[PDB]
Amino acid sequence: IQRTPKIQVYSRHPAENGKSNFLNCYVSGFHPSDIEVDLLKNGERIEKVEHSDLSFSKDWSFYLLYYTEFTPTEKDEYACRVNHVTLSQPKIVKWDRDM
Amino acid sequence: IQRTPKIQVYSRHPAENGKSNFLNCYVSGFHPSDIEVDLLKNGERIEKVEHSDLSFSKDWSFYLLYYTEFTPTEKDEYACRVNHVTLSQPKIVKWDRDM
Amino acid sequence: HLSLLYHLTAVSSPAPGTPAFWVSGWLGPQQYLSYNSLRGEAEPCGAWVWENQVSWYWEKETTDLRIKEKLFLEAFKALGGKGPYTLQGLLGCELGPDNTSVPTAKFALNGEEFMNFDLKQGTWGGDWPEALAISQRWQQQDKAANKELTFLLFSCPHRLREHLERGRGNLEWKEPPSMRLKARPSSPGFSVLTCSAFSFYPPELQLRFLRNGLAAGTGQGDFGPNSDGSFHASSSLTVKSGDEHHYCCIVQHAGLAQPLRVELES
Amino acid sequence: LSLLYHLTAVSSPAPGTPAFWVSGWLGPQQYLSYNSLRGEAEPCGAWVWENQVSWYWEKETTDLRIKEKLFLEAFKALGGKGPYTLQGLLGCELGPDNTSVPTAKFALNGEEFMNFDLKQGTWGGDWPEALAISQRWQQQDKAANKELTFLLFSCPHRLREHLERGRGNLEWKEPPSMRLKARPSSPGFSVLTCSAFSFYPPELQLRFLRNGLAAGTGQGDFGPNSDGSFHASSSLTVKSGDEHHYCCIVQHAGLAQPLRVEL
Amino acid sequence: EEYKVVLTFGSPMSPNANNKQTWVNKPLDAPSGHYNVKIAKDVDHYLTMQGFTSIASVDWYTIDFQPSEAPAPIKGLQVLVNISKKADVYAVKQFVTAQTNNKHQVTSLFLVKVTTGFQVNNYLSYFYRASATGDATTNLLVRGDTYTAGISFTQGGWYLLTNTSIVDGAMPPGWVWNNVELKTNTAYHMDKGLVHLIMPLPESTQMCYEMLTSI
Amino acid sequence: EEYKVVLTFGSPMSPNANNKQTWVNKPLDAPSGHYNVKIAKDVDHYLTMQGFTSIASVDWYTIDFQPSEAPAPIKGLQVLVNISKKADVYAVKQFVTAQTNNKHQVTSLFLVKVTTGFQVNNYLSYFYRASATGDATTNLLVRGDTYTAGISFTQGGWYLLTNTSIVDGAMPPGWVWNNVELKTNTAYHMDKGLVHLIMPLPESTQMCYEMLTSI
C-alpha cells in the first residue's frame, strides 16, 4: 500500500524566547520508507539537522524524527518541508509555538 | 371499480331547538348503486324518511340525499347509518349542530 | 356553458321493486327529466313542470328513452360472464361559445369508462372487451346507430335551444344564505370555529375566515344539497383557545352583492 | 514489558542508505540499532550505561547478521518487478510467570503477509509472495532453528537480562512541563492548545474543563523528543471570549496527583 | 407457456436519466384531462402502470435455456389508455413477497410492445430511504409529493411495465389483480420486479426473468 | 472462459434481514483485532470485500446458454483475511459505468466458494436517499456512521462478494484494481452489480450474469 505522511512540528521544551531549545519535526505514518525532510529557518534549509532511527509503528507505517538545536527569537519562522512519493509537491508546516 | 361512500349529515335551516327543520344525510361518490341509508333518532330507524333519485356525478359515482322533517330538542341525538358493499360494518355519522 | 345532458343507468340484477333502468335529464345544474323502466314515462321535475313544453315534446322524449331502455338492457345479455353489472351513459350536447353544439356520448361499465360513440361511421367505439361486445350487439340493432346519431347531432341541440326560451328563469334563481359562525373547543389550547351557510342557490358560495381583519385561510369545507334544491355549506377552522373572537367569517354568494361578515354568537 | 526488533529491507535502497536496518525496542525505548553499512549492533541512548557483558553486543550482531542475510535473500525469491519493502516484527513479551509469548510477523510493501508458525516450525502465510519467501527461507540451512531460538530462548533470556540491567532505565519518570495556550484561528471561535512538553513514560492523558465542569478532550497529537522523551498536545475549539473560563487537566505517571494548567 | 426472457435495457425515458432517481407513477389517478396506462383483462381486472422502462432487445428461451422464437401476444391482455388500445402484452410475471403477516407485496411485470405511439402525463414519485442512527432499520418508502410529467411511448418498441400492490389480508390463489397505488409512509421490500426502479440501469444491461404467456 | 452464470440467491446473512437495509462493509480497515475480507492476486493487486450475500446454487452455461461443466478455481485469485486463505474465486466480473467524463464507477463481483469456515467483524453501512421537493435530483449515497457487526461465512458455501470504487481522472485499460472505500457524501449510480445491495433479495431469486474466469 502507499500512505501519505503526517507532519508535526514542535519544541522539546516550552518556546522561551532567548533560551536554547530543540525543534522536532516528526513525520509519521508514511509508506514506503524514502522521504525528504528539511527543517527551515525563514525559508532556509537548516544544515545542522539530525534524524532518529527510521522505525515503523504497529500499522507497518514508518516514522522518523528530525530535530535541531535552536534558540527562538520574537521574529523568526520555523517550518518543516516534506516530500514523499504520495505528495505531488512538498508539503510545508509552520511551527505554532502553541504546539 | 368499487368506491366507498362519503357521508355528510346536516340540517336544512340553522339548527334551532324546538323549531321544525329537516335532517339531511347526503351520501356521495359511491359505486355500485345499491346503498342502504337509515336515519336514526337516538338509535332508531325513522319510518318517515324520504330520499332523492339515485344520480351520478361526472366520475360515474352515485350520490343520494336522504331527508326527513324533524324538531331538534335540547337532549336528543340524530345520526345516519350507511351500509354499502365496500363497508365491512355499517358506518355511522352523528349530526353535530355546527353544520 | 348551458348543456343538455342525460344520465342513463342500467343494472343487471336490480333490487326487488327497483327499476332496472333509469334516466335523469339535466339543463345546466338542474334536473328537468326523470324516467324509469317501471313508470316508462318521461315526467318533468322541479320548476319544469310549469314549462309550456307541449305534451308531444314529452311523448317524443319518452319514446326515445324506451328505445334506450331496450339498448341498455340488451347490453347485459351481449356481455356474457357472471354479473352483476352497472352500465352508465352520459349522452348530451353543450352550447359552445359561438352557438355550436358539442356532442357528448360516454359509457361506463362497473364504474370504469369503457365506451364512446364515434359519430364518424355511426359506431360505438372502445377497446375494452365488453366495449366490443356491447358495440357489436348495438351495431346489429334496428338503425340504433342512426337513432344515436340523431340524438346527438340534431335532437339534443334543438331541445337545448327551446329549453333556453321556456325555462331560462328557472336557471337564474337566486336565494341567499342564512349564516351562523359558531365556536367549538376542539381540545385544551385550541378551538374549532364552524361557519355554516344554510339555504342558498346557485350552489357557488365561498367562505373565508378573517383574523382581526387580516387574511386567514378558509378551512375544511363540506357542501351538499337540500330537498328543495337549495344547498348547505359549512367550513371549519382550528384557532387558539381564547382567540375565538377577533374572527369574522366572510361569505360571498350571488344573493349578496356586498360580501357578508358573520361574527361569533353568544 | 516487551522486546521487539523492527527489521526493514528495501530491494532498491538509495545510495548510502542501508538496504537493511534494525531498531530494537524495550517497551517504548529504543536500545539496539543495526544496519547493513556498519554491520554491528550498537546500544542506543541510555543503554550504553547498563552493565551489559562485552560479548552480549557481539552475539546480538551475529544474530542480526543472519537476519540481514535472510531478508536480502527474500527479494531474490520474489520474482516479479521491484521495488519491494520487506518488514519484520520479531520479539517476545514477558508474560506473568516467566512465560515468554513470541511475535513473528512480516509485511510486504506494507501489507501484512507472513508469520512464523511455531506449531509447524516454519514461516507461514497464504499470499503468493508469502509462499515464495517462506519456501526460500525454509531451504536456507538451519534458518528455521535460528529463528526458533531467536524467539524461544535468545529473546526471553535477553529480556530478563536487560530487565535486571535496565530496571532504572525502565523506571524513568519525567513529569511533563505543561503550557495551556489560546489561538484565535477560527473567526468567532478561538482554539485552546494544551501542551505537555518533555515527559516519560508516554502514558499521558489530557482533559479540557469548562468553568470547572468537564468540557471534553481536544484533537490529540503525540510524538517523541530528541532525548527519547515524549511530547503531547491537545486542541479544543471554543467560542471567542470564553477561553478564560477553561482549564486543562493532565494525568501523567510522573505527577503523583493530576496537574491543572491555566492560561 | 413458461419462457425465460433475456431483456436488454435501453436508454432512460423522460423524466428519468442515468444520474437521477427512477421516477415511477404513484397514484391510480391522473392530471385533469390525462389518463393512466392500464394493463387489463377486462373492466374488472386491470393493473395501473407504475414503473416504465424501455427494452432494446428481447431474446426468448425455453424453461431450460434452449432458444425459442418470439411468441404471439397473450390474447385477452392489452395496454389500454382511456378507451383506446396502445400495446400488446407478450409476457407477464408476478412476484409475491410476504411482508410480515396479513400483508403481501405483489409486483407484476408486463413485457408489452407498443402498437400506437402515445403520451401521458402522470403523477410521478420515487423511492427514498432516510439515513438513520445505529442499526436502526430505515424503510424503503415512496415519496408523497408527486411530480406531474409526460411519459412518451414510441411505436413498435418493447417496454417493461410494473405494478406493485400491498395486498392486505387474505390472498387469492391465482393471479393477484389488486390495483393498489404506491402508498406513501408505507415500507416496501425488494423483489426482482423492483431492482430496476432505484436508479435507471445503464444501457444494454441484461436481465433474465421466468415469465408466463397466460393467466 | 466467458460463462453466463445463474445464481440462485440464498437466505440473508446476518446482520442482514429481508425487511432491513442491506449492510455492506464501508471502510478499508477493520475494528481492532479483526480484518477485512480481501479478494487478492498479490499484495499490490487486491480489492476489499464490501457487499456480502450468500448464493444457494450456481448453474453454469456457455455464452449461448448451453450448459457447461462447473469450471475450476481461478488460479492466482483467492479470498484472504490477514495471512490465512479462506475461499476460492470461481468467476469474476467488473462493471465500469462512466458517472462523468473523468469520474468512473467500477463495480467488481466475485463468486467465491468458502474452503475454511470463518467470521469477521467489519464496519458496516447502507445505502440511502433523502426525499426532495419537486424534480430535485436526489442522490444515492452511503451512510457515514458505521455499525460494527460480525459476518459469518460457512464452509463450502457459495458467496457473492462486491467492491465498488470511484476512479477519478483517466482510466486504465484492463481490470481496475483501485481499492477505494465507499466514500461518504459521494453519490453512486446503480449498475447490475448493485441491485442486491439495496435490500436483501427474497430467497430463491435468480440472476444471470456474464462473467469471466480469468484476468
Residue numbers in the entry:
A (entry chain D), B (entry chain G): 21 to 119
C (entry chain F): 27 to 292
D (entry chain C): 28 to 290
E (entry chain H), F (entry chain E): 430 to 644
According to the publication:
Human astroviruses (HAstVs) are a leading cause of viral gastroenteritis in children worldwide. Recently the neonatal Fc receptor (FcRn) was identified as a receptor for HAstV, however the molecular basis for the FcRn-HAstV interaction remained unclear. FcRn is a heterodimeric receptor formed by a heavy chain (FcRn α-chain, or αFcRn) and a light chain (β2 microglobulin, or β2M). The viral genome is encapsulated by 180 copies of the HAstV capsid to form the immature HAstV particle, presenting 90 dimeric spikes.
To understand the molecular basis for HAstV spike binding to FcRn, we crystallized and solved the 3.4Å-resolution crystal structure of the HAstV1 spike - FcRn complex. Consistent with the size and ratio estimated by SEC, the structure reveals that two FcRn heterodimers bind to one HAstV1 spike homodimer. There were two complexes within the crystallographic asymmetric unit, with the most dynamic regions being the membrane proximal regions of FcRn. At the ~ 570 Å2 binding interface, two loops on the HAstV1 spike wrap around FcRn residue W154. The W154 side chain sits in a hydrophobic pocket formed by HAstV1 spike residues A469, V472, Y475, and L509. Similarly, HAstV1 spike residues V472 and I512 sit in hydrophobic pockets on FcRn. The negatively charged FcRn residue E138 forms an electrostatic interaction with the positively charged HAstV1 spike residue K467, and it also forms a hydrogen bond with Y475. The FcRn residue N136 side chain forms a hydrogen bond with HAstV1 spike residue D473. The remaining hydrogen bonds are between FcRn residues D153, W154, and E156 sidechains and the backbone of HAstV1 spike residues K514, N511, and V472, respectively. Finally, the HAstV1 spike - FcRn binding interaction is capped by β2M residue I21 contacting HAstV1 spike residues V472, D473, and Y475, forming ~ 40 Å2 of the interface. While these sites may be important for interaction with another host factor, FcRn does not bind at either site but instead binds to a largely non-conserved region on the side of the spike dimer.
